[PDB]
Amino acid sequence: GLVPRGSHMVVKVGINGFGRIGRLAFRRIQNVEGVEVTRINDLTDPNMLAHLLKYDTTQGRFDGTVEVKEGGFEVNGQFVKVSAEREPANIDWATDGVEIVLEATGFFASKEKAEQHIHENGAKKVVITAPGGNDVKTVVFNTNHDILDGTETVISGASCTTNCLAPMAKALQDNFGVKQGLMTTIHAYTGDQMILDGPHRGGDLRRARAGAANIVPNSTGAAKAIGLVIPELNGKLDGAAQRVPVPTGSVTELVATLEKDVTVEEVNAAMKAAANDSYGYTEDPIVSSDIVGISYGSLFDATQTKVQTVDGNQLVKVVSWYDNEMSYTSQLVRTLEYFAKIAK
Amino acid sequence: VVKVGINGFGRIGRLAFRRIQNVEGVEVTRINDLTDPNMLAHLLKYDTTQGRFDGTVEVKEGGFEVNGQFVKVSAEREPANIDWATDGVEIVLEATGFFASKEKAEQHIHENGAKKVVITAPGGNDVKTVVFNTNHDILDGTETVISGASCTTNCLAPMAKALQDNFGVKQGLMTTIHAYTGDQMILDGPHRGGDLRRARAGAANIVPNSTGAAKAIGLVIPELNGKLDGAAQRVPVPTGSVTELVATLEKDVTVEEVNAAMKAAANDSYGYTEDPIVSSDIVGISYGSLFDATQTKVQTVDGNQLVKVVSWYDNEMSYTSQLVRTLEYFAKIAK
Amino acid sequence: VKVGINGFGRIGRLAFRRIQNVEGVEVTRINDLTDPNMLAHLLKYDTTQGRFDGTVEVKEGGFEVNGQFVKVSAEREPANIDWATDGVEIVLEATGFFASKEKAEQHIHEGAKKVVITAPGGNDVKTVVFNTNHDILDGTETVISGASCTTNCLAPMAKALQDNFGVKQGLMTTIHAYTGDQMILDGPHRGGDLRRARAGAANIVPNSTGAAKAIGLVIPELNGKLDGAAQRVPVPTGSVTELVATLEKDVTVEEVNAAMKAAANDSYGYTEDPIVSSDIVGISYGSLFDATQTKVQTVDGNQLVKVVSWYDNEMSYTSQLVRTLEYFAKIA
Amino acid sequence: VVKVGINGFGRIGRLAFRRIQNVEGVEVTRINDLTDPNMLAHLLKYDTTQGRFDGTVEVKEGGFEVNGQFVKVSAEREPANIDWATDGVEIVLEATGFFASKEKAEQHIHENGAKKVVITAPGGNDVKTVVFNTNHDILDGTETVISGASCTTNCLAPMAKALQDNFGVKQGLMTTIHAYTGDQMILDGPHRGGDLRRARAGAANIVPNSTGAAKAIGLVIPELNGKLDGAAQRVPVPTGSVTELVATLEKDVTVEEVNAAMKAAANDSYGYTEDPIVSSDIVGISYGSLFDATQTKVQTVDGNQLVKVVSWYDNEMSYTSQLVRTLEYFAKIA
Ligand SMILES: NC(=O)c1ccc[n+]([C@@H]2O[C@H](COP(=O)([O-])OP(=O)(O)OC[C@H]3O[C@@H](n4cnc5c(N)ncnc54)[C@H](O)[C@@H]3O)[C@@H](O)[C@H]2O)c1
Ligand SMILES: NC(=O)c1ccc[n+]([C@@H]2O[C@H](COP(=O)([O-])OP(=O)(O)OC[C@H]3O[C@@H](n4cnc5c(N)ncnc54)[C@H](O)[C@@H]3O)[C@@H](O)[C@H]2O)c1
Ligand SMILES: NC(=O)c1ccc[n+]([C@@H]2O[C@H](COP(=O)([O-])OP(=O)(O)OC[C@H]3O[C@@H](n4cnc5c(N)ncnc54)[C@H](O)[C@@H]3O)[C@@H](O)[C@H]2O)c1
Ligand SMILES: NC(=O)c1ccc[n+]([C@@H]2O[C@H](COP(=O)([O-])OP(=O)(O)OC[C@H]3O[C@@H](n4cnc5c(N)ncnc54)[C@H](O)[C@@H]3O)[C@@H](O)[C@H]2O)c1
């Protein structure tokens, strides 16, 4: 009884932080009827933003036309406004008809700080493109978007790694039950790393290092905070990251103990059965470049599955790919579209 | 002074050579590869990842001089055709990657050939496989062919042994996040070994790949035979690797106990650090394995424990350091 | 017209991909040194050029592409390849090992009627940069060259310069992607090159190129006027060609850019956007002039002119190769 | 016994510090940056491109100890607020990239501040710009603010000077194939300086970019003023660069004459090699410029000659070596 809108009823969106996720989100929204970006806010002039939309190192040239104008740029004819406002509270989203804001700066990933968008002459609601702590409903599309009723003011699209891990973990539990698990994600370097060795503004002595010239260990909360997405796994998973020199493209390895004894084929079959728009399945021996730009939020790879049986005991290894950029963004926009229809 | 020959003056061959400069009683008098001395001299002088050669290298007829001393160079495809004896070589380093087998390595041993061979890679199950300071006990000096194991084995072994000796290991799964190597293609292309993943551009991809190091650990630590398995993710750094092990133990542990056990096991071969380092920081190190306490994890869910232990290794110099330790010791006991 | 590919490598596989969208040209046979499973996989998946747009399924002695079977053989010697059995008239010689009239002719026997070499062939072979000198083809030739990657980039740019202002002399530098003839890590180079021996994805690597010297084969009125060299750098594909020249006419920056813009077509593109190498990966221009890098230096009376054009050493070259192949197939 | 302070403990700051360990009579007693000592100590110990620090480093309150000796660390955004004098600092290395101007560098000089400043980058005009062993003649020791020039200038200068002194230079165009640097974005993103090319992922692109080193060579070799221009192609190596110069000369030359002239000009600052090396081979070298004879070209078409000369430089250590030579000499002449 959620009374969703048709794709003909156009919900106007604003993007805060026209960065990697911001710009790719924008690109995907071009092919989503009933969702339209009318305003972008960042920290720079429209010329910079127009150029970065047209040309993209890892995701290819923009499919369309982009022409710069005063206070914005035109995309296939349609003007989009550009503002350069550091404070979310100072952004007059309402003037451009924006109901929902994509918070994609990385600096306001908190209920308190995201709410700052909602005010007189501002936006109605906000989707954070990152974990927003617990306090905020955290959604991995096609895993737990049940949880949305449309009354929420602030929601999170979770992290890149969470959207990869969730379907894979859920499938495991639903079929065999998960006792505990440790995760490693071999991850592309990202914009929060230094291009060369230098002082890291967040105090991280590893993200301080040249990201495109090192294997760089780093912490991730995605495994710990999986309880926010699959409640019956709360406190059962932990993990970490190894950041490596590819500009996008990642993979998540999970090592787990299960309640049921399993064989490799049963695991792969279970994953194949769980496949959908969000969770893909493959038996081809692919590498990271092969998953750049894919629209699955997670792509299980059967060729890497391991089931080790020593004495009575079993360790199970399951691996899924994800383009930390497009995989996440695809999920984000699915979630945004659904949230826009259901919005109160 | 025991005179050594190198077959395959490649990454491991050239670094082995470099280390032998600072090992008294071991001397390389002959190199065999598939090319002229000029190529080999240049590749010794200049090294992308391991820096300029510390010394002088001048090309000559049929070889080159290193700090004055001439080293002979031959270009012989067949090991059986290499007259090692003429240059006084008793032990050969087999480092080509093409003769990693007892049958094929023995081919070096003949009339005017070598007495013994050390393979710079896993050889068969019928060859003694040595990780220095872990199981070099196993050598008596009568062996004709030995293996220095793989890069990953020398990293994993001390870490695993320490775990067992202190807490006992039920089972374990390993992932090594590994530098790309010369058996990968620089760009997408047909892989001569039939591997559809090593066929891909190695410096532009995360590339999954199999490794037997975890399975064949029994050859080094017999009491772990059949308890470990694992795999690799090859990534774009030209050298430098790290080994992650996830294990169940017989004893319940804490993070601090694990780190302490590792620290206690530290020596020339197994290093210990609490600094939050990255791969470039371990390029050129002489430890075969370097435990990193900052990455240790002990997860306790209900009664049950999963333990995670991580050690760095320069797949190049770490392995090579161990190889030369093993070579030195094997040379001095060669009865 | 039925075509065969010898060497299903970077250029071979991309040529194949482009031929999917060329009506009247069809690849019925591939020869390499490996099993069909390897070749099918490498066609489907491509690090730099993206997933294959279509379906590929392996079978006995070949694979099916969107239903249609393509035969695969693994024959080391060109003379032993029975091209005729699969209806092949023209062979793309793309192995890098038979870039010579003598060695390319080895395909013609029964076998194939004609051959296009995907690289500089001898001085006794017609060397074609499409939309620059494909005039030179009459269709009677048995062996032709599609030139090098850097030649197809340089030619339109140089021709435009001469046709408008006249070229006295010029020096070229191409900042070039690393290629399959470099070592992934420091190691013995089979061709004896001490620089291609070095890890290609971790070094700026100087290297020689004959494209500037042998431009006479494409633009005769520039013969002996140009020389140059390469700096190979760590990107897996994508390159750029810088030319520094003295001209007969005094020029301004705007006149040069305008001349280039006027010369623009399917082969020679023009842009004023400040792009980088990734932006030209997969483009179909053989050369893409970049006005933002143009320089005209006037010291005393004298002028040095700098002109720069991008090219995807992979797809740019391949696009030109297939244009040339299509046109050559139409004639006989 | 001259005490130095470093402003901006970055790539050049930290390598300068490292080299000063092996310079008697020069000692760093204070570092100012924008972060805690723990970050700076770690970045000194461990260095992706230049290797582990040769010595011992232990963090302390308000600083760290290097081989026993304490060095103070402050985190002061404004140069005018840095009390350099309290730690005995006479000369400051301005290495932040934000104060490369006489006006802005002078802000270091005040009551309880420093006496003099060396900018690790091109400063204005009316700042003396020094490439060691090329034009350090120009220093008398009375100057308050000096520039150590750019990375590319220290590479180009000895090469160009040698050319003019032997054959005379009419004009020239330069291309430097350059390592990516900290002013590029790690991934495509808004560039604070408005550069649409430095906005792009620096380790995944060939990135064209402008450089003034060729234009402003007149500040170092006056008799070349207005004769040279050039540009850069930034490429994916984390350090290590090479400078190509194409020139017309007053004299007709052969390849061998050019190489010989360069060899004759060789010294501590300008090196000479005939080995076919690549960029990694010059990482960490102490030459400010390293001529490579294997890349020399002399093209003669009709009567006319175009001459090509190429020299390597580690934009990091090559520059830094020159900077410290210049700093040492400037400290002794104050
Ligand atoms: N792989 C990924 O990139 C990835 C995946 C999933 C989630 N995320 C998350 O998405 C967010 C952004 O990631 P990214 O890689 O796109 O970052 P990015 O750095 O590429 O882009 C962030 C943008 O925010 C802008 N910005 C910063 N402060 C601002 C302010 N006060 N007002 C307006 N604009 C501001 C910057 O100019 C920049 O363009 C982060 O929260 C990140 O954790 C990233
Ligand atoms: N990371 C590492 O490099 C590493 C670590 C541990 C063990 N290993 C092992 O060491 C061996 C070599 O590894 P690499 O990385 O140095 O390889 P590499 O490609 O760098 O070296 C191979 C060398 O062998 C030469 N060669 C090939 N066939 C020959 C023949 N018939 N006769 C003489 N020489 C021949 C080649 O010319 C080349 O110089 C392999 O067995 C490998 O598995 C490598
Ligand atoms: N890739 C480029 O940048 C580029 C640009 C312009 C021209 N070219 C030219 O194209 C040719 C191929 O280059 P590439 O980059 O595709 O190299 P590549 O290494 O990708 O392709 C070579 C292919 O030929 C096969 N091969 C080798 N020997 C063979 C034989 N005897 N018989 C049959 N097949 C054999 C190999 O298995 C491989 O698949 C070269 O002549 C090169 O000069 C390449
Ligand atoms: N790296 C090179 O290739 C190179 C070569 C020659 C010259 N330079 C010059 O050296 C200077 C620094 O370059 P870099 O490569 O070391 O950059 P970098 O980013 O590594 O160093 C800059 C450092 O200065 C600090 N900083 C910034 N603002 C500050 C302030 N207000 N007060 C104190 N500290 C501050 C930063 O925290 C950082 O640690 C630039 O002018 C650059 O042009 C660099």
Side-chain angles (χ1 to χ4, degrees), chain A residues 184 206 209 214-215 236 253 286 288-290 301 303 308 313, chain B residues 171 175 197 200 205-206 227 244 277 279-281 292 294 299:
Chain A
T184 296
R206 269 160 167 163
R209 309 299 294 281
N214 285 296
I215 300 166
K236 298 199 158 203
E253 290 191 2
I286 55 168
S288 74
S289 58
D290 303 325
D301 177 4
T303 70
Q308 194 195 35
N313 301 324
Chain B
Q171 59 180 134
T175 295
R197 269 161 166 163
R200 309 300 294 282
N205 286 295
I206 299 166
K227 298 199 157 204
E244 289 191 2
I277 55 168
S279 72
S280 58
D281 303 325
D292 177 4
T294 69
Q299 193 195 35

mmCIF file of all heavy atoms in Angstrom, chain A residues 184 206 209 214-215 236 253 286 288-290 301 303 308 313, chain B residues 171 175 197 200 205-206 227 244 277 279-281 292 294 299:
data_model
loop_
_atom_site.group_PDB
_atom_site.id
_atom_site.type_symbol
_atom_site.label_atom_id
_atom_site.label_comp_id
_atom_site.label_asym_id
_atom_site.label_seq_id
_atom_site.Cartn_x
_atom_site.Cartn_y
_atom_site.Cartn_z
ATOM 1 N N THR A 184 38.034 -9.933 2.816
ATOM 2 C CA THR A 184 39.071 -9.074 2.237
ATOM 3 C C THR A 184 38.567 -8.559 0.899
ATOM 4 O O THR A 184 38.075 -9.336 0.085
ATOM 5 C CB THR A 184 40.375 -9.841 1.984
ATOM 6 O OG1 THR A 184 40.906 -10.290 3.229
ATOM 7 C CG2 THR A 184 41.405 -8.957 1.304
ATOM 8 N N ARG A 206 48.378 5.222 5.817
ATOM 9 C CA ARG A 206 48.427 4.383 4.635
ATOM 10 C C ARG A 206 47.797 5.054 3.421
ATOM 11 O O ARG A 206 48.335 4.962 2.320
ATOM 12 C CB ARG A 206 47.820 3.009 4.939
ATOM 13 C CG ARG A 206 48.884 2.035 5.406
ATOM 14 C CD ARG A 206 48.341 0.832 6.159
ATOM 15 N NE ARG A 206 49.387 -0.192 6.300
ATOM 16 C CZ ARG A 206 49.365 -1.213 7.155
ATOM 17 N NH1 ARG A 206 48.346 -1.380 7.986
ATOM 18 N NH2 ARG A 206 50.371 -2.084 7.168
ATOM 19 N N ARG A 209 49.963 7.386 1.347
ATOM 20 C CA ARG A 209 50.924 6.887 0.365
ATOM 21 C C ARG A 209 50.390 6.920 -1.066
ATOM 22 O O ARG A 209 49.171 6.878 -1.306
ATOM 23 C CB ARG A 209 51.356 5.474 0.728
ATOM 24 C CG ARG A 209 51.821 5.325 2.179
ATOM 25 C CD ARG A 209 53.025 6.197 2.503
ATOM 26 N NE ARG A 209 54.189 5.752 1.748
ATOM 27 C CZ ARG A 209 54.941 4.700 2.064
ATOM 28 N NH1 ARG A 209 54.677 3.970 3.144
ATOM 29 N NH2 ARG A 209 55.970 4.377 1.290
ATOM 30 N N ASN A 214 51.273 1.374 -5.034
ATOM 31 C CA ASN A 214 51.391 0.555 -3.820
ATOM 32 C C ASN A 214 50.207 -0.370 -3.643
ATOM 33 O O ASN A 214 49.080 -0.040 -4.031
ATOM 34 C CB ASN A 214 51.464 1.440 -2.560
ATOM 35 C CG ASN A 214 52.814 2.113 -2.381
ATOM 36 O OD1 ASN A 214 53.825 1.445 -2.185
ATOM 37 N ND2 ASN A 214 52.833 3.448 -2.451
ATOM 38 N N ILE A 215 50.468 -1.512 -3.015
ATOM 39 C CA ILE A 215 49.429 -2.277 -2.326
ATOM 40 C C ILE A 215 49.292 -1.626 -0.954
ATOM 41 O O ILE A 215 50.256 -1.592 -0.190
ATOM 42 C CB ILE A 215 49.801 -3.753 -2.168
ATOM 43 C CG1 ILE A 215 50.006 -4.383 -3.538
ATOM 44 C CG2 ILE A 215 48.718 -4.495 -1.408
ATOM 45 C CD1 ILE A 215 50.702 -5.727 -3.503
ATOM 46 N N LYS A 236 28.342 -10.820 12.917
ATOM 47 C CA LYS A 236 28.933 -12.083 12.457
ATOM 48 C C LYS A 236 30.116 -11.925 11.491
ATOM 49 O O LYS A 236 30.889 -12.872 11.300
ATOM 50 C CB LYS A 236 27.871 -12.946 11.796
ATOM 51 C CG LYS A 236 26.744 -13.328 12.739
ATOM 52 C CD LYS A 236 25.960 -14.531 12.229
ATOM 53 C CE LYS A 236 25.235 -15.234 13.362
ATOM 54 N NZ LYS A 236 24.956 -16.651 13.012
ATOM 55 N N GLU A 253 36.414 -10.906 -1.426
ATOM 56 C CA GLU A 253 36.604 -12.290 -0.989
ATOM 57 C C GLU A 253 36.022 -12.458 0.410
ATOM 58 O O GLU A 253 36.305 -11.662 1.309
ATOM 59 C CB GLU A 253 38.092 -12.641 -0.934
ATOM 60 C CG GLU A 253 38.797 -12.760 -2.286
ATOM 61 C CD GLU A 253 40.195 -13.369 -2.173
ATOM 62 O OE1 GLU A 253 40.603 -13.727 -1.051
ATOM 63 O OE2 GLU A 253 40.887 -13.494 -3.206
ATOM 64 N N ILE A 286 37.305 -14.026 -15.677
ATOM 65 C CA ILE A 286 37.492 -12.611 -15.980
ATOM 66 C C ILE A 286 38.485 -11.935 -15.027
ATOM 67 O O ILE A 286 38.879 -12.517 -14.010
ATOM 68 C CB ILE A 286 36.151 -11.855 -15.928
ATOM 69 C CG1 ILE A 286 35.446 -12.056 -14.582
ATOM 70 C CG2 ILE A 286 35.255 -12.335 -17.058
ATOM 71 C CD1 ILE A 286 34.278 -11.123 -14.348
ATOM 72 N N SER A 288 39.687 -7.648 -13.518
ATOM 73 C CA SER A 288 39.027 -6.400 -13.098
ATOM 74 C C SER A 288 38.522 -5.505 -14.249
ATOM 75 O O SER A 288 37.430 -4.958 -14.158
ATOM 76 C CB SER A 288 39.926 -5.564 -12.181
ATOM 77 O OG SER A 288 40.980 -4.940 -12.898
ATOM 78 N N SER A 289 39.295 -5.354 -15.321
ATOM 79 C CA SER A 289 38.868 -4.481 -16.419
ATOM 80 C C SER A 289 37.547 -4.956 -17.040
ATOM 81 O O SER A 289 36.767 -4.139 -17.552
ATOM 82 C CB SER A 289 39.931 -4.387 -17.497
ATOM 83 O OG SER A 289 40.225 -5.675 -17.988
ATOM 84 N N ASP A 290 37.283 -6.260 -16.969
ATOM 85 C CA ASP A 290 36.062 -6.822 -17.545
ATOM 86 C C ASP A 290 34.780 -6.393 -16.841
ATOM 87 O O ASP A 290 33.702 -6.551 -17.401
ATOM 88 C CB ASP A 290 36.119 -8.345 -17.555
ATOM 89 C CG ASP A 290 37.307 -8.867 -18.298
ATOM 90 O OD1 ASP A 290 37.713 -8.250 -19.307
ATOM 91 O OD2 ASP A 290 37.862 -9.891 -17.872
ATOM 92 N N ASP A 301 31.553 -14.818 -8.908
ATOM 93 C CA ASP A 301 32.475 -15.506 -9.800
ATOM 94 C C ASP A 301 32.711 -16.932 -9.308
ATOM 95 O O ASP A 301 33.461 -17.163 -8.351
ATOM 96 C CB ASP A 301 33.798 -14.735 -9.885
ATOM 97 C CG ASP A 301 34.846 -15.442 -10.746
ATOM 98 O OD1 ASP A 301 34.551 -16.498 -11.355
ATOM 99 O OD2 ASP A 301 35.978 -14.921 -10.809
ATOM 100 N N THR A 303 34.363 -19.344 -10.598
ATOM 101 C CA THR A 303 35.702 -19.894 -10.832
ATOM 102 C C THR A 303 36.626 -19.764 -9.618
ATOM 103 O O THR A 303 37.659 -20.413 -9.577
ATOM 104 C CB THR A 303 36.429 -19.211 -12.019
ATOM 105 O OG1 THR A 303 36.776 -17.865 -11.665
ATOM 106 C CG2 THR A 303 35.575 -19.213 -13.285
ATOM 107 N N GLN A 308 36.868 -25.898 1.575
ATOM 108 C CA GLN A 308 37.910 -26.697 2.186
ATOM 109 C C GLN A 308 37.327 -27.509 3.327
ATOM 110 O O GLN A 308 36.719 -26.954 4.245
ATOM 111 C CB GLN A 308 39.009 -25.799 2.727
ATOM 112 C CG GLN A 308 40.277 -26.555 3.077
ATOM 113 C CD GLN A 308 41.221 -25.740 3.927
ATOM 114 O OE1 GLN A 308 40.795 -24.938 4.774
ATOM 115 N NE2 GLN A 308 42.521 -25.947 3.718
ATOM 116 N N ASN A 313 35.549 -30.273 9.673
ATOM 117 C CA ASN A 313 35.316 -28.837 9.560
ATOM 118 C C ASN A 313 35.442 -28.269 8.144
ATOM 119 O O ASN A 313 36.259 -28.726 7.330
ATOM 120 C CB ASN A 313 36.265 -28.094 10.492
ATOM 121 C CG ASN A 313 36.087 -28.498 11.941
ATOM 122 O OD1 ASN A 313 34.974 -28.754 12.388
ATOM 123 N ND2 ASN A 313 37.187 -28.563 12.679
ATOM 124 N N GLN B 171 42.682 -25.811 10.326
ATOM 125 C CA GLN B 171 42.715 -25.597 8.877
ATOM 126 C C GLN B 171 42.893 -24.116 8.558
ATOM 127 O O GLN B 171 42.744 -23.262 9.441
ATOM 128 C CB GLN B 171 41.434 -26.110 8.220
ATOM 129 C CG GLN B 171 40.157 -25.463 8.737
ATOM 130 C CD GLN B 171 38.906 -25.981 8.068
ATOM 131 O OE1 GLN B 171 37.932 -26.273 8.752
ATOM 132 N NE2 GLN B 171 38.915 -26.102 6.735
ATOM 133 N N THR B 175 45.056 -16.102 0.941
ATOM 134 C CA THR B 175 45.039 -15.244 -0.242
ATOM 135 C C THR B 175 46.344 -14.462 -0.250
ATOM 136 O O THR B 175 46.701 -13.851 0.759
ATOM 137 C CB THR B 175 43.855 -14.244 -0.223
ATOM 138 O OG1 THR B 175 42.621 -14.966 -0.288
ATOM 139 C CG2 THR B 175 43.916 -13.300 -1.414
ATOM 140 N N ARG B 197 43.751 -16.067 -17.648
ATOM 141 C CA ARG B 197 43.897 -14.894 -16.798
ATOM 142 C C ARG B 197 45.300 -14.283 -16.890
ATOM 143 O O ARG B 197 45.433 -13.062 -16.945
ATOM 144 C CB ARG B 197 43.493 -15.226 -15.360
ATOM 145 C CG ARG B 197 42.023 -14.940 -15.130
ATOM 146 C CD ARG B 197 41.418 -15.638 -13.920
ATOM 147 N NE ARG B 197 40.115 -15.055 -13.603
ATOM 148 C CZ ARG B 197 39.181 -15.616 -12.839
ATOM 149 N NH1 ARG B 197 39.380 -16.805 -12.296
ATOM 150 N NH2 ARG B 197 38.030 -14.981 -12.626
ATOM 151 N N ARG B 200 46.001 -11.827 -19.723
ATOM 152 C CA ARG B 200 45.574 -10.436 -19.656
ATOM 153 C C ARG B 200 46.691 -9.487 -19.208
ATOM 154 O O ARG B 200 47.644 -9.886 -18.530
ATOM 155 C CB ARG B 200 44.367 -10.298 -18.723
ATOM 156 C CG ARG B 200 43.229 -11.269 -19.028
ATOM 157 C CD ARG B 200 42.667 -11.091 -20.440
ATOM 158 N NE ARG B 200 42.013 -9.795 -20.574
ATOM 159 C CZ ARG B 200 40.799 -9.518 -20.114
ATOM 160 N NH1 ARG B 200 40.065 -10.453 -19.505
ATOM 161 N NH2 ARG B 200 40.316 -8.296 -20.255
ATOM 162 N N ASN B 205 45.320 -4.748 -14.442
ATOM 163 C CA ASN B 205 44.215 -5.578 -13.960
ATOM 164 C C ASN B 205 44.493 -6.172 -12.599
ATOM 165 O O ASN B 205 45.648 -6.449 -12.250
ATOM 166 C CB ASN B 205 43.963 -6.752 -14.926
ATOM 167 C CG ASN B 205 43.272 -6.329 -16.209
ATOM 168 O OD1 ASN B 205 42.129 -5.887 -16.192
ATOM 169 N ND2 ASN B 205 43.956 -6.495 -17.331
ATOM 170 N N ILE B 206 43.425 -6.389 -11.844
ATOM 171 C CA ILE B 206 43.431 -7.359 -10.748
ATOM 172 C C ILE B 206 43.150 -8.696 -11.404
ATOM 173 O O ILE B 206 42.108 -8.871 -12.023
ATOM 174 C CB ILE B 206 42.353 -7.055 -9.706
ATOM 175 C CG1 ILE B 206 42.596 -5.672 -9.090
ATOM 176 C CG2 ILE B 206 42.349 -8.111 -8.616
ATOM 177 C CD1 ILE B 206 41.419 -5.129 -8.300
ATOM 178 N N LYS B 227 46.261 -29.324 5.331
ATOM 179 C CA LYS B 227 45.453 -28.433 6.181
ATOM 180 C C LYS B 227 45.194 -27.051 5.575
ATOM 181 O O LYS B 227 44.279 -26.348 6.014
ATOM 182 C CB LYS B 227 46.109 -28.257 7.542
ATOM 183 C CG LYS B 227 46.229 -29.555 8.315
ATOM 184 C CD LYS B 227 46.447 -29.305 9.799
ATOM 185 C CE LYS B 227 46.023 -30.512 10.620
ATOM 186 N NZ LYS B 227 45.692 -30.114 12.011
ATOM 187 N N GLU B 244 47.854 -13.139 3.128
ATOM 188 C CA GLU B 244 46.828 -13.158 4.157
ATOM 189 C C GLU B 244 46.453 -14.608 4.425
ATOM 190 O O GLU B 244 46.185 -15.370 3.489
ATOM 191 C CB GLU B 244 45.582 -12.408 3.692
ATOM 192 C CG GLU B 244 45.716 -10.894 3.608
ATOM 193 C CD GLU B 244 44.376 -10.188 3.405
ATOM 194 O OE1 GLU B 244 43.333 -10.878 3.366
ATOM 195 O OE2 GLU B 244 44.357 -8.939 3.291
ATOM 196 N N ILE B 277 52.972 -0.006 7.129
ATOM 197 C CA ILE B 277 53.695 0.108 5.872
ATOM 198 C C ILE B 277 52.843 -0.316 4.673
ATOM 199 O O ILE B 277 51.762 -0.888 4.835
ATOM 200 C CB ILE B 277 54.985 -0.734 5.904
ATOM 201 C CG1 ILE B 277 54.693 -2.197 6.266
ATOM 202 C CG2 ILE B 277 55.960 -0.142 6.909
ATOM 203 C CD1 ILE B 277 55.853 -3.134 6.031
ATOM 204 N N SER B 279 53.350 -1.705 0.205
ATOM 205 C CA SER B 279 54.204 -2.626 -0.563
ATOM 206 C C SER B 279 55.575 -2.066 -0.918
ATOM 207 O O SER B 279 56.566 -2.786 -0.848
ATOM 208 C CB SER B 279 53.505 -3.108 -1.836
ATOM 209 O OG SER B 279 53.417 -2.087 -2.811
ATOM 210 N N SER B 280 55.653 -0.795 -1.306
ATOM 211 C CA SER B 280 56.948 -0.226 -1.707
ATOM 212 C C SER B 280 57.965 -0.267 -0.560
ATOM 213 O O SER B 280 59.170 -0.370 -0.794
ATOM 214 C CB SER B 280 56.795 1.205 -2.188
ATOM 215 O OG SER B 280 56.218 1.996 -1.169
ATOM 216 N N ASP B 281 57.477 -0.220 0.679
ATOM 217 C CA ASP B 281 58.355 -0.257 1.854
ATOM 218 C C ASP B 281 59.096 -1.578 2.058
ATOM 219 O O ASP B 281 60.068 -1.612 2.800
ATOM 220 C CB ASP B 281 57.569 0.036 3.127
ATOM 221 C CG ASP B 281 56.865 1.353 3.074
ATOM 222 O OD1 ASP B 281 57.410 2.302 2.470
ATOM 223 O OD2 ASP B 281 55.743 1.430 3.609
ATOM 224 N N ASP B 292 53.179 -8.496 9.860
ATOM 225 C CA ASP B 292 52.645 -7.161 10.100
ATOM 226 C C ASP B 292 51.522 -7.227 11.136
ATOM 227 O O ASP B 292 50.392 -7.624 10.833
ATOM 228 C CB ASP B 292 52.135 -6.558 8.786
ATOM 229 C CG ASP B 292 51.496 -5.184 8.968
ATOM 230 O OD1 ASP B 292 51.497 -4.640 10.097
ATOM 231 O OD2 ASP B 292 50.981 -4.655 7.958
ATOM 232 N N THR B 294 49.835 -4.909 12.523
ATOM 233 C CA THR B 294 48.735 -3.947 12.351
ATOM 234 C C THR B 294 47.527 -4.535 11.617
ATOM 235 O O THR B 294 46.458 -3.943 11.652
ATOM 236 C CB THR B 294 49.160 -2.694 11.559
ATOM 237 O OG1 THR B 294 49.401 -3.051 10.189
ATOM 238 C CG2 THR B 294 50.409 -2.041 12.150
ATOM 239 N N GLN B 299 38.629 -12.868 15.329
ATOM 240 C CA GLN B 299 37.191 -12.708 15.382
ATOM 241 C C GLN B 299 36.601 -13.827 16.223
ATOM 242 O O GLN B 299 36.834 -14.998 15.947
ATOM 243 C CB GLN B 299 36.597 -12.764 13.979
ATOM 244 C CG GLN B 299 35.158 -12.294 13.923
ATOM 245 C CD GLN B 299 34.478 -12.683 12.635
ATOM 246 O OE1 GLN B 299 34.736 -13.754 12.071
ATOM 247 N NE2 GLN B 299 33.580 -11.824 12.166
#
